[PDB]
Amino acid sequence: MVYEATPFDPITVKPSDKRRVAYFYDADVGNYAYGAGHPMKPHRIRMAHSLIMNYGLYKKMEIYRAKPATKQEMCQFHTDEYIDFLSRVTPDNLEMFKRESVKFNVGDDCPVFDGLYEYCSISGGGSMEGAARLNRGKCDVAVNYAGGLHHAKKSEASGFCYLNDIVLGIIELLRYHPRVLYIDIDVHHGDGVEEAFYTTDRVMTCSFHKYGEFFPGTGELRDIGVGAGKNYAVNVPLRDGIDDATYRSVFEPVIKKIMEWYQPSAVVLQCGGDSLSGDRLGCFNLSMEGHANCVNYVKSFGIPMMVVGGGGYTMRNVARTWCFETGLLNNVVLDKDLPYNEYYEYYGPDYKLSVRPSNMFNVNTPEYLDKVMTNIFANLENTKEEDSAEAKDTKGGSQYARDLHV
Amino acid sequence: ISLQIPIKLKSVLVDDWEYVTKDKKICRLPADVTVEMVLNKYEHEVSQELESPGSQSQLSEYCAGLKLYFDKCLGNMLLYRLERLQYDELLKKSSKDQKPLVPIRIYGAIHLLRLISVLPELISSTTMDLQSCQLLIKQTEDFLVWLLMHVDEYFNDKDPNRSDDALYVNTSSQYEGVALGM
Amino acid sequence: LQIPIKLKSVLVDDWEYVTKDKKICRLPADVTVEMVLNKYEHEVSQELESPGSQSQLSEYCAGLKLYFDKCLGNMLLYRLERLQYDELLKKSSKDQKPLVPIRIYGAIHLLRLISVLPELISSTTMDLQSCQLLIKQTEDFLVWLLMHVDEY
Amino acid sequence: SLNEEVTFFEKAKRYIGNKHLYTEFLKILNLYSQDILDLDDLVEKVDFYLGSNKELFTWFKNFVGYQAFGPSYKRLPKSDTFMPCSGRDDMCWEVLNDEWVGHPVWASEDSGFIAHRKNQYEETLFKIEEERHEYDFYIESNLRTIQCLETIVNKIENMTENEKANFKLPPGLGHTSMTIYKKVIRKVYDKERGFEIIDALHEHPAVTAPVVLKRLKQKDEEWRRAQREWNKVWRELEQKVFFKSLDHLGLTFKQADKKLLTTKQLISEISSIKVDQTNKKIHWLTPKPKSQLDFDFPDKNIFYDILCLADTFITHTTAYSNPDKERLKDLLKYFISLFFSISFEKIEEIFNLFANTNIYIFFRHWTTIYERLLEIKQMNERVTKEINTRSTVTFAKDLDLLSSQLSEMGLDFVGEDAYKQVLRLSRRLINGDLEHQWFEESLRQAYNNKAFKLYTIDKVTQSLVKHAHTLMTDAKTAEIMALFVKDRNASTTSAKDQIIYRLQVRSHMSNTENMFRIEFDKRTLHVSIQYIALDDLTL
Amino acid sequence: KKRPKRLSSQNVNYDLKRRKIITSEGIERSFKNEENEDFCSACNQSGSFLCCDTCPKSFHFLCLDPPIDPNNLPKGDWHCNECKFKIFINNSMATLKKIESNFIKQNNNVKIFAKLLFNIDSHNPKQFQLPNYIKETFPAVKTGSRGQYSDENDKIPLTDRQLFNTSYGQSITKLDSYNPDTHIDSNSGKFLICYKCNQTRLGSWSHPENSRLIMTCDYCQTPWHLDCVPRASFKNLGSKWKCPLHSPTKVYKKINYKVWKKQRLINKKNQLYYEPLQKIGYQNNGNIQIIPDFKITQIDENSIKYDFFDKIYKSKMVQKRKLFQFQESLIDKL
Amino acid sequence: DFCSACNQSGSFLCCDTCPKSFHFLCLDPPIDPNKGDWHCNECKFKIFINNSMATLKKIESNFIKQNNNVKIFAKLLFNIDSHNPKQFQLPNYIKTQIDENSIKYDFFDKIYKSKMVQKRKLFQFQESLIDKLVS
């Protein structure tokens, strides 16, 4: 109800609940590049998998290689012409699609590269297979670091995002789970996910982002919802450099009230490297410990949840955070020492599993967050195809990426 | 030469300019205030309320000339660059439905006001007898006064976010991408 | 602009009777304009007047009184009434007293002010809204005077 | 009630205090009264106007009898809704929306966005990450293509020749991917030749596949040895930039502390919190009995540590004369021993004070040095336990990946008290043998960028001794401190000597100089400052 | 010790990044024998163009009288609409006469619109621009760099203020450095005072966390704390910020709805006009200004207070009448 | 000759500017018939401010501001001496620092009168409810 300014408590695992974790990964997701000077690069997933494949975490969880989504599946939310354009555009014939490159906003903000359709299909199939496995009870927590995009609209490509696999996973979750809650904990607010469920009540979005004429420009205490979606779109705008304790104090009570009033049957988490320490885009000061503590807080209630990797521009920090999140989801803590992997020389000079908080000024005053939370809780008072729905995915357990050499 | 226009219609035109260029809005293709019915209503209202001393022939000549001028004037100096794409879409639809396009019947009175505002420059563009210019300007001023007499019936402000019939709809991002930047 | 007519037959009776006996034989009126308007104010301002502002009615009474003070010898008399006004001016001159017409004239002099009011209202640059409010106030006053023919 | 509703407008006018805002308030009231604005928006607007006046706004609410979307998401017409997706069933059609959409170009009014500012060290790190990502992406794509092609050629060679001649393959090479091998071929060959090489590999394997695999193996060997070669440069560059990249405030602190420690800055701060009560708000509980109530001195040994720092800077400075140096040291020692209860313990390692601006600025410098050193002392045990248990990873130690020539010049913080170590480092910088940049790097490595306030400890100590020299050069401040010495009698005889004390310090002061009352209680080591603007001056 | 000048590793590429010498490698023996300007003439805008050769003028693909899709271009040296006359009808053949005078005989009873109907096709297409006899009658509206509308947005948008030092030129991500500059106005050297909590909240150099973010309104220069208004950061792009102490431009009522799109300013010989007629209620539909065609009424303070009290007491009266009707219904229930 | 203020011919009254006949006992101003040069009331208005000074300046703008609590017409209170008065004819359709205190007292009196009006109306409604209840 009021911002209590409680200090950052340690990350309690509370192992009373044991969650069967299904990690979805494809070896082909890291072999696609946007180009030099571009913030988005899917190569960060490969080292996130490598850190996962170097802690012995495969002995506590199920690895999965999802079948990539087809045109009949990504068109469950996107228009047919957008998917038809995306499956034929390559960076050698853009002049033949000069109209559709600016119609669907595929220019310089979202460039064209080889395997773009393949990467989008991989991400969509991963999200779909994770949601189908969560729906049938085959897993307790589904991990989808291999691709996840919140900026993608119905027929618009924006935010270095092309295919909104999050809404596809939510749609898959919507066929059995009635009430789904989408939690966003990064900067560059998920306007695509929020606007895709703005006028519905069975799915509501909660985003902790940055406002003040940032890149998305969407997210406000007045952005609440229209039609049947009134009081079913929650935005918590934050200023620059919110630290770990401030993020905990602004994250835990609103989540507690949200699930004490909405009580969702499914959770979609959008953890990412956008709200981490100093990277190419983003101004938050939330370190590894607070970012993992938010997810561990979400893990404390034992709700069947989705964790989806989103942004990330500095691959070492986002890989460290995703590895610690995977370890926390398996009811264990990881040592700060980094094991020897294929990207041993990639990480920082300390070579430790830690993202250092950049000592910069925090402008999130207690009274601003107090009035934001009072407005949010006032808005919260009223809250009281051929092979779709497919759980068919390859096991992919024979592969390994663990290094046992010098 | 010179035209005197009511100030309320000038404010309506400036609001149209704001809605198109700044607020990025376009008029509704299913117009209920179209140029043909508005001109016919004006002609009948000024013809059934007074006698015919021979000036009604001149008024019908002016109405027919305005209709013929709006038939082919809409695609040349009207139609801001944003709303050109809707015009192309309806032209393609009309050509697909084997029907020649008549913009008098499917465009509202805002474009008629735009034509009236531009009309002095078109008058100065061509070489005309001055008495003909004075007569045409007098008829245009009388029609503008009549339009001011029914300003609320044909021009009403309504937010498209709160109502579906507001003579102005929002534009999708695909519309902005195709119409502007290409 | 037009004023409703119910009791203006008294006005034409006076118009016929000014040439006979002037319709008034007492140079100071027994029932002057001051107490007539005071009884009107004590009658309407708490019976039919809605709560809120009564300043429009008080300002109407004050403006009517001040206009009557400026209506001296101007569209308010007949020829015999002009002679009566000359006599009043003469008898108000030896005692140097400023002759106010409110305390010397009766309700018969109000009707000629109200009847000529729309013609001179239309004779000046006056906003139509103010004309509507003024004719509404005069209609109210005449309606109040309809049930008070004793003063008439 | 009685004679209150008539005075509401005058009360509102005197409360607003601005004529333009009063005219706007009257315009809002009028447009409410024209049956245009409803009661709820009127009450909200008055709440924006009156606000903190709880009684007036509550009476307004009692008098008036009072008890849908944001700046984005404009609604599209239903004509554009009918965009066939061919994948939407009834549930997708009923749970998704096609009318209310918002775009980033609409939220910024087509004026763009401002990216967050990053220092050039962060840009160097971004360049390093881009280069490492490009090298590793090329390495991994080539290695995956080599794995696929080596499986292909093994399956070629282990069988006979008739199906070796005809092994027509679809796109994908029997794998789940479609174009990674195409990308590798296009990168290793020309643009116009990669297509034809891919075509002949698809339509005619077993003739060209082993040769292209050998070529890719040679290219991968070159790429691997070059990545090994350049990784040393990339590792050495990021070691000197990473702590600079994290320290967003440290590189600007050299200018920020110089800009915001002058006399005018402290005058403005203390006058701002002085006027922070003298405003439209009502006066309650003798407002402003103390200007700030925030100047306590909890620690003690910090007194002796700052005294040692000042002694070292005095022995280093060549500005003041040696008798001036000795008299400055004695004056600082006596001022510290008299303003507090310290009886000059060894350093070998309610009472008021009415004074001018110079003593105030000098004591402000003393307090800010004390506050920075106390903030360092607060996390001393935690940072000592962290620096004493920083276990280096064994594989990084064996591979010589550990950071060299950063703390190997004696700038390490391991095995010693961190607060004493930073005190010794500040003393060495005061004499000058340690580069200021290297001191900042050592502090960043030790305290994890939490000690950017100690970057200019030498400069603030220089300002400290400079303002202490101003305490002993003019007769006015000398008379002020002499009267301060005469004021401290180890006893409290206040409420009688205070008035003539104020008059006496007024006789040694100008008629426009701001008075500062430096109060200090006998216990709890508390000092507070009263900013007097000569309101006590009755002349 | 960095020294990246040598150690070039040209084996792959001397360039730190990816030079194209691997593309220059050519082992392929595996087969082994088994004048036009740059703006739209109708638009004055950049982008893709369709350029004619007979004239330098070029148009956009959509801004043409027969608006053509870029995916199906007309082949055969397409000419502009003006160019569809010079080397075509009415200028090349059947010339040596004024075709405008000859056009009059084709149509009748359109004599006042005859030569205009002749001249309509003799001109190139052009986007609609409001002529300089309508828009200059409003002193706040302006024509943008692309012909866009502009009335009260943030004037002179930043062009060189996007680059600065590590101190953020437009925001407060740094420490207390911008606090004494922003909290103190340069006109009088006095601390700016927030309207909600009447204080400065300047904080201190020692404790910058106590300071609060404050910026003035763009119209009335009202100092407002960022924590006293639903605002996240500074409004320095797009439109000017408006503090909540201003009269609304357009409002909606609902019990379909009304808009009341303000009044605007008419500066054509100051035509806006003023008139002081009777007080105590006027039905002026807003558009007032305070003294101590488009008609701005003249209204003083006592008229406003009398109208407000009249509205309040009328509301009390109708409420009382509704209560009377409810009690009458209750007594007819018995 | 005639008399527009007498509706008859009668006697003659001369005027220096635009001589229009009247009666000596029926002058437009109520002054002594026996005299020097006399201007008509419309002529007096013409020579007051319409000739050379205060003509572009509108005195009506000052006149509306200087009659407090009398605002029903500033026009008819101004143009009452701007023309020569005539005999009344039956029309054809029948056959500072102290003004603020004063207006504050007037506002208080109006609010009080509204308060007794509200109290009497309430009391009447309450009595009506009472004697309807006892039936």
Residue numbers in the entry:
A (entry chain A): 1 to 384, 405 to 426
B (entry chain D): 220 to 401
C (entry chain F): 222 to 373
D (entry chain B): 661 to 727, 750 to 1031, 1135 to 1324
E (entry chain E): 33 to 66, 258 to 478, 488 to 524, 536 to 577
F (entry chain G): 261 to 294, 298 to 358, 540 to 579
Task: Reproduce the article's own wording on this structure.
In Saccharomyces cerevisiae, cryptic transcription at the coding region is prevented by the activity of Sin3 histone deacetylase (HDAC) complex Rpd3S, which is carried by the transcribing RNA polymerase II (RNAPII) to deacetylate and stabilize chromatin. The overall structure of Rpd3S reveals that the Sin3, Rco1A, and Eaf3A subunits form a large continuous scaffold to hold the Rpd3 deacetylase in position. Rpd3S utilizes the conserved Sin3 basic surface to bind to the nucleosomal DNA positions at SHL + 2, SHL + 5, and SHL + 7, under the conditions involving different H3K36me3–CHD interactions and DNA linker interactions.
To visualize the structural architecture of Rpd3S, cryo-EM structure determination was performed using the purified Rpd3S complex to generate a three-dimensional (3D) map of 3.5 Å. The electron density of the Rpd3S structure allowed us to accurately define the Rpd3, Sin3, Rco1A/B, and Eaf3A/B subunits. No density can accommodate the predicted WD40 domain structure of the Ume1 subunit in this high-resolution map. Rpd3 contacts an extended conserved motif of Sin3 (residues 748–801) that we term the histone-interacting motif (HIM) as it coordinates the H3 tail substrate binding (see later sections). The equivalent binding site of the Sds3 peptide is occupied by the Rco1A N terminus (residues 33–66) as revealed by de novo model building into the corresponding density and further validated by cross-linking mass spectrometry (XL-MS). At the center of the Rpd3S structure is Rco1A (residues 258–561), which contains the PHD-SID domain (plant homeobox domain and Sin3-interacting domain) (residues 260–374) and the conserved acidic patch-interacting motif (AIM) (residues 377–397). The C terminus of Rco1A consists of a long helix, which interacts with the equivalent helical segment of Rco1B. The density of the N-terminal chromodomains (CHDs) of the two Eaf3 is not visible, suggesting that their CHDs are likely mobile in the absence of the nucleosome substrate.
